[PDB]
């Protein structure tokens, strides 16, 4: 099996062979601070900030 590939802040990363998901999480911890997490993960749950997917470079 090929291993999932995900977008990660402009780069393309090859996920650990165990990963099921590419994710994209954006948050505003403070009115002036935006946080953006992005990459591969074993688990993923759709929320208003965490976007999940399971195909290649799908972010």
Curated annotation (Swiss-Prot):
The terms describing its cellular component in GO are: extracellular region
Write down the position(s) of the site called Key residue for inhibition of rat ASIC1a, probably binds to rat ASIC1a F-350: 35
Intrachain disulfide bonds: 6-22, 15-40, 44-52, 53-58
Keyword check for RNA-binding: no
Marked site, Important residue for inhibition of rat ASIC1a, at 30-31, 36-37
Which keywords appear in this protein's UniProt record, sorted alphabetically?
A: Disulfide bond, Ion channel impairing toxin, Pharmaceutical, Proton-gated sodium channel impairing toxin, Secreted, Signal, Toxin
The reported effect of residue 37 to A is: 58-fold decrease in inhibitory potency of ASIC1a
The record gives the effect of mutating residue 26 to A as: 3.9-fold decrease in inhibitory potency of ASIC1a
> As annotated in Swiss-Prot or TrEMBL, what is the tissue specificity of this protein?
Expressed by the venom gland.
Question: Which GO molecular function annotation, any one, does this entry have?
Answer: toxin activity
Where does this polypeptide localize? Secreted
Q: What is the effect of changing residue 11 to A?
A: No change in inhibitory potency on cASIC1a
In UniProt terms, what function does this protein have?
A: This three-finger toxin inhibits ASIC channels. It acts as a gating modifier toxin by decreasing the apparent proton sensitivity of activation and by slightly increasing the apparent proton sensitivity for inactivation. It binds more tightly to the closed state and to a much lesser extent the inactivated/desensitized state of ASIC1a isoform of ASIC1. It interacts directly with the outside surface of the thumb domain of chicken ASIC1a (ASIC1a), but does not insert into the acidic pocket as suggested for mambalgin-2.
Family statement = Belongs to the three-finger toxin family. Short-chain subfamily. Mambalgin sub-subfamily.
Additional comment = Negative results: has no effect on rat ASIC2a, rat ASIC3, rat ASIC1a-ASIC3 and rat ASIC1b-ASIC3 channels, as well as on TRPV1, P2RX2 (P2X2), HTR3A (5-HT3A), Nav1.8 (SCN10A), Cav3.2 (CACNA1H) and Kv1.2 (KCNA2) channels. Does not produce motor dysfunction, apathy, flaccid paralysis, convulsions or death upon central injections (intrathecal or intracerebroventricular) in mice.
Q: Please state what the protein is called.
A: Mambalgin-1
Origin organism is: Dendroaspis polylepis polylepis (Black mamba)
